[PDB]
Amino acid sequence: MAAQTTMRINISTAQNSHQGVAIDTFAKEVEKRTGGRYKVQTFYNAALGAERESVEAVQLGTHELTFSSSGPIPNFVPETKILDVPFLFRDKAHARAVLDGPIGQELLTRFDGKGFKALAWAENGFRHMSNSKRAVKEPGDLKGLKMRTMENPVHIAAYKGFGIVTTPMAFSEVFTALQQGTVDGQENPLSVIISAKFDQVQKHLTLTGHVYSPALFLMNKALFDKLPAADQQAFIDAARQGAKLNRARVDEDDAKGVADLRAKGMTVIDNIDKARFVAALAPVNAQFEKQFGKAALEQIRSAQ
Ligand SMILES: CC(C)(CO)[C@@H](O)C(=O)[O-]
């Protein structure tokens, strides 16, 4: 009898997180939907690499699958940059609808020519600013903060627009950098801040919600293409189910997160005027309009 094929998938976050739910659900569904013919071993906390290294590894084929935020993706697939524009998405429902519908479907196609099968869009969440130095109540309070960023050119340009001094770093370095005070802060969804225990190394958090962070199930293209057609469908369907449970965990994290982090001693600013943060980014946003075009930005904004 043919040997079960085993593949590996990893993330940079904890098993007990929104992304751990994503990959564990995916793995369970692949095994079920392929009648046990495929099995997926799951790795966490940047085992097998943090996100950029892992996306590269999947492209090379050194392991088969990864689940990553959109953060490091533009280096590989430039077309996703528009998703990383600050304040583009009104809320999670808007973002999820865009990604699941034809706009997001078109973006999945852009991975094919770069050596991936992008199985499905999933979610990291809306990102929020934390730091060790001071409470952030207005955009001016961000000026001069030394902040870690992802390896993403849109985020870096945007945050420089707030006067932040940016340091791109792989996620596997971040807890220690915060602890050592190399940087004052970072930015991430509540799902990450909670699961990574950043309350232990960050006194301040503001719910700026300044960008939406999608995530992706990625597979090596050559490997995906060699699967029998029915198993290709099983992998896609498993990824979509992983996205569903992932998003549900994000919802739970976002609902409980302010109370959870306050109880852990963080000062959490959840009353800001977001419109002032948008206004502060006007010059950078004018650049993004020139870069992406009004047509593409309005196409996303129009979405229901
Ligand atoms: C935590 C993370 C790896 C999750 O995708 C990402 O948001 C990041 O690098 O900050």
Structural biology method used: X-ray
Tokens encoding 225: 């293409």
Task: Give 52 Cα–ligand 1 centroid separation in angstroms.
Answer: 10
d(CA 111, CA 119): 10
Q: How many CB atoms lie within 10 A of CB 8?
A: 19
Structure token digits, residue 162: 């707030």
3 state SS of 91: coil
User: If you take atom 4 of ligand 1, which residue's CA is the nearest one?
Assistant: 69
Task: Give the domain CATH number at 144.
Answer: 3.40.190.170
90 is in an annotated binding site: no
User: How far is 124 from 81, CA to CA, in rounded Å?
Assistant: 16
How do 204-220 and 38-43 pair as beta strands? unpaired
The residue range of the domain holding 225 is 2-304
Question: How far is the C-alpha of 161 from the C-alpha of 142, rounded, in Å?
Answer: 10
Atom number, ligand 1, closest to the C-alpha of residue 196: 1
Left if phi > 0, otherwise alpha if psi is -120 to 50, otherwise beta: which for 19? alpha
Q: Please calculate the CA angle 248-25-99 and round it to the nearest 5 degrees.
A: 55
**146-149 and 165-168 as β-strands: parallel, antiparallel, unpaired?**
parallel
What's the total number of domains in the chain? 1
Q: Which residues line ligand 1 (CB under 6 A)?
A: 12-13, 51, 69, 71, 124, 150, 171, 188, 192, 213, 215
Alpha carbon distance 290, 151 (integer Å): 22
- Cα 138 from Cα 171, distance rounded (Å): 26
